């Protein structure tokens, strides 16, 4: 019993952070093999942020001009290469601690863990969602560009964020470790905002199949709903629209708690018209959507890495 | 900006997460130098649960009858003691990713970062509070025995519990890592159950600064309170009373926002009296209680 925001142990990310300093910017890196991999921004000053041009910045820039500081241990840069909106430092050293990774790019609704780092040295881990708008609703500080966001499956990490800068709002917005941006956002000091959010549908859907499971049932009703209907309710209420392939992905939580896919849109769409009526769902007041169906059958059945 | 609920980065407990099987139970035990910490339950038969005698059941049991796994390596066990609720193998190898450690007791209220682990497998990092009723509002299922519970203030791990147990309302009941519970339980089956739980007054202060510290102010007032009227107040709501040490501990916030802690007590009065109004407290419609004085100042600050 018992539903936490969980996320997964930060072990095989911790042994891989850097810190990285180029001029007065010190940011985070991440180091795998022999590459240290970071936000290209790192080699902006203050009145370069506001209009770079980074292959001219980059090529005035030298080996030696990169510090790399794992640890207490200073890192010798022998090469430097931008991808994207990513700096890769070539160092002479092979990280001994690379886990099994790879390289995804996730889709908004899908949740990671946050390793958040300041200096090279990680301070804390949390469990977020990549938000329909392309933001991550974090919790950062100046310095934490480079922390970055990860699954686990079985004993390979999915490095699937590196954090670059904090919109106006106080969310967050970075790329894959590819370089691309998630959203439409650019890395330069410029007026950018975060477009109108809405409620990841999927998710709320899994986490009242947790309450299920966890003996929650105030909720349920004996109506059901069709898809159409249901997709009509969630547009008015800022609902992301729910798909077929959200339905089959819920049938596993269908399955087991015995309630349609249909079944529990319509308790959906009752709380969304009615409310809570001072009641909550596993601790909460709001409906939680930064939860998939996926973390929801892990974390209720105790998936090991 | 931004606030989380945040744990700790758990690699420096990864490395000490071991199986530990006796007979037919197996649960998680803490490999640090040469000794295994697990719970001592570890020994019982199920049937044994309902008055088991410890001393009796150790006595009986050699070093050869615990199996201790790291990883795909078997430990080999040369010596068994317990004390008080855990039972401490002797190990022939010492960890070698044993970091810089204490055994800490917390209070309640305190918040700490659980590893919780399967087969001496960890899946997951959450953070948690010991509630004033002395349990923890966890998610362990069969098998989390011997979960741990810690702080990493600098580069030193402070272990402050072990899992042991689940209550029948779901809830979690535990021990510091000498094996002694908190709260008024046991490691036996019997009718057991947690106490009325309240709301840790203290950290719903801390939040509601660390709110006015990201720019929320839409609930502040022009009151001030007494501390007794503010605790005659809060005890009606289920809320811890709130001693003089605790307005001393929030005195940095205070200072860092210009708000005196009596003028956010009765914020707080005001917030109980009238609920959210459809509004929200750091994306929150529920007053958070998780987050102590000292977790604000090291996240926000
Ligand atoms: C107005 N700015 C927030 S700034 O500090 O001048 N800024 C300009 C900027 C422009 C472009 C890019 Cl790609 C990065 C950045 C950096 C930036 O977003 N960093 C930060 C990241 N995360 C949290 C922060 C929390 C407080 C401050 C900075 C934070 C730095
Ligand atoms: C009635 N029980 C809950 S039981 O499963 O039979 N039980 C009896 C018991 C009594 C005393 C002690 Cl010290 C331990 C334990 C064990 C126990 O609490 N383990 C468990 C621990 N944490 C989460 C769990 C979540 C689902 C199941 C067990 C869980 C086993
Ligand atoms: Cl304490």
Known sequence: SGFRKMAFPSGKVEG???QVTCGTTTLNGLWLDDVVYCPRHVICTSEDMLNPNYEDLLIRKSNHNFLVQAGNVQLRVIGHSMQNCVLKLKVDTANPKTPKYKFVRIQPGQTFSVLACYNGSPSGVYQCAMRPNFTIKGSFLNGSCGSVGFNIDYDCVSFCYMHHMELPTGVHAGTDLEGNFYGPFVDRQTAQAAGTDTTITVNVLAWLYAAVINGDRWFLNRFTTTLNDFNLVAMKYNYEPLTQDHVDILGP???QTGI???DMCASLKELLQNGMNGRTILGSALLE?????????????????
């Open 16 to 18: 891989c952070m850097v």
């Open 253 to 255: 939580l269908s399955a």
């Open 260 to 262: 349609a896919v249909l």
């Open 289 to 305: 959507d930064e939860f998939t169906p996926f973390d929801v059958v892990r974390q209720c059945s105790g998936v090991t890495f």
